[PDB]
Curated annotation (Swiss-Prot), chain D:
One of its GO terms (molecular function) is hydrolase activity, acting on glycosyl bonds. Belongs to the tail tubular protein gp11 family. GO terms for biological process: adhesion receptor-mediated virion attachment to host cell; symbiont entry into host cell via disruption of host cell envelope; symbiont entry into host cell via disruption of host cell glycocalyx. GO terms for cellular component: virion component. Homotetramer. It is found in: Virion. Pfam families: Tube. It comes from Klebsiella phage KP32. Its EC number is 3.2.1.-. Signal peptide: none annotated. Keywords: Degradation of host capsule during virus entry, Degradation of host cell envelope components during virus entry, Glycosidase, Host-virus interaction, Hydrolase, Viral attachment to host adhesion receptor, Viral attachment to host cell, Virion, Virus entry into host cell. Transmembrane segments: none annotated. This is Tail tubular protein A.
Length: 196, 186, 185, 184
């Protein structure tokens, strides 16, 4: 097939990665706001840690769901269960491009006939959520800055932090749009056709 | 998702926090009308200290009781034993028009009870201290109280004009905040 | 006490008022993005008019459904069909507070006994939808400005319109929030 | 809702709008490259005009066919001809979402059932091509700039034009990507 993301995350079950990379990002958000870093997230005393984690996760998902070159599995072949005919829509999946295949209850559902059972494999273009050490630097900068900005604004309101972050976010956001101009916006309009 | 307030204050029993952050805000009110700061709020004498503290508390409650992103818990769970659930001093409001406070206890008015089969998940507004809210809100609250304290007891004109400008600026910033974060509904 | 909303709209059968007030509010959204006003909302079949009207309706219902001093009736008594014993939950009703009565059909369904059907006898806190000339000016301005901003953003994307409308919405919200704090608690 | 595109274009006969908005966009491509504007798009004569118009149409179709909040009708109802059962797949139609219905030879074709004839109306999610004055400003700027760059690159090769157009495209794309994330 085609190019894949750095992380496949096939066994992700929770909303969060629970990783060193996620901790580092949350610790950056805390720092921005004047709070000292923690050694684990998991574990679950403070409101500020929990809130930063949540804000970060939502922004991460919102930006990644658009779909970009680094988080796209260009030609993913999905094979149904032999007995049930089912294909799980796994928790790390953000979207199947095209408007035909959607998540219904944790299962890939085909709108062309109205079914979640398949007699053979399907090949689709899939967006898979990546962790912060699995994306280009410009994306980690845009997501973690945007999250820091929101965390500041919602709970703290330090204006020097806001002015500073607004500028860093603008710059990362321009860099991510320059990326997309180089790599292209995937459109479903196999790998060869994916021409756009 | 769900985000919580920075302060939970479950063991708050009085009307006041009694914190350093409270003292700093009262001291700003006193400075605004030319009185000197105090090192504690534990009843000192001083009618001006007491009055500032009370005006500040009332304005704080009034503003915070509207419900804002920073003091709303969208999924707070309250477990009742005796069936009963206390409505604590830090609770301002449970949104939605079903549960309310009956002399210190949560009253479920879908059934007219205040005893509960299990536990409940509600949307709850909880009073935050001055170091637990965004700067714009502290500014609005503290400036509004300062102005009220001036007008009620002193009436200095240059204070009034100055505070009025600051209150208006804070109030715009708080309305911008809510446009960014949204008003909760249901 | 008991004060009532200015509009009860019992005969309202579809989603829209169809009123002169609605027409004015739509013409205002049209003026904001540079289009000409219309003389009626009974189109054919201008897309812009249909879209403005839907967006405006949705925002109106959304903001009003919170419940405010101007659109709550703390003791609305509703009376059944008798025969069927059935109480409609009408287009103009946004919600019944308290947690017991809810919209099944709509009807009206007592979620604490059965039961779609009633002997008489029912008194209730009702939030009812007001028309654009039946609310305080600040709420009309909020609803219309917010609707105008969604209409712009989705279909037009004019940056100066957005900036200007955003400061108008903020002004309206500042007045509605004073209203909410003044009448509430 | 319930919301519909600004333009339905049910009577478009060919690939092009023929409109003042189309003319103005082609004139902008001509200006980017140092050529004078024209008063109309079919005379013809002009190779540059014909090529700019084709490039612009192709880019316009390609970007729009993704489907956006401004050009999706979530419940378009299409009604078959009574005698024939057929439903034309019109030139302004870009796609029908879901994987069931496609354009086969100019007719709406249900590829799941394996039929292009229908006993009554169908209601579908239709993406319909908008004119340059019927889309949000950031999309017109994206499409016209992109088209300008392809026209330059293929026939002119002016490097200063490419550098300046590439900045303006990036700026437009940034606004269109905020739109996509805001309306997604």
């Amino acid at each position: 097939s085609g190019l894949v993301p750095r992380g496949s995350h096939m066994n992700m079950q929770d909303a969060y990665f629970g990783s060193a990379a996620e901790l580092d990002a949350v610790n950056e958000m805390l720092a921005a706001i004047g709070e000292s870093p923690v050694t684990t997230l998991d574990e679950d005393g403070s409101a500020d840690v929990a809130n930063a984690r949540r804000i970060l996760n939502r922004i991460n998902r919102q930006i990644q769901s658009k779909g970009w070159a680094f988080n796209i599995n260009e030609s993913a072949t999905l094979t149904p269960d032999v007995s049930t005919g089912l294909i799980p829509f796994r928790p790390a999946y953000l979207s199947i491009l095209g408007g035909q295949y959607v998540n219904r209850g944790g299962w890939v559902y085909d709108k062309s006939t109205g079914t979640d059972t398949f007699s053979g494999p399907i090949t689709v273009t899939l967006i898979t959520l990546q962790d912060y050490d699995e994306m280009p630097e410009c994306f980690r900068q845009w997501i973690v800055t945007k999250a820091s900005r929101q965390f500041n604004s919602r709970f703290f309101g330090a204006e020097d932090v806001e002015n500073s972050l607004a500028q860093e976010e603008m710059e990362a956001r321009m860099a991510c749009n320059e990326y997309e101009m180089d790599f292209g916006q995937y459109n479903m309009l196999y790998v060869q056709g994916l021409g756009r």
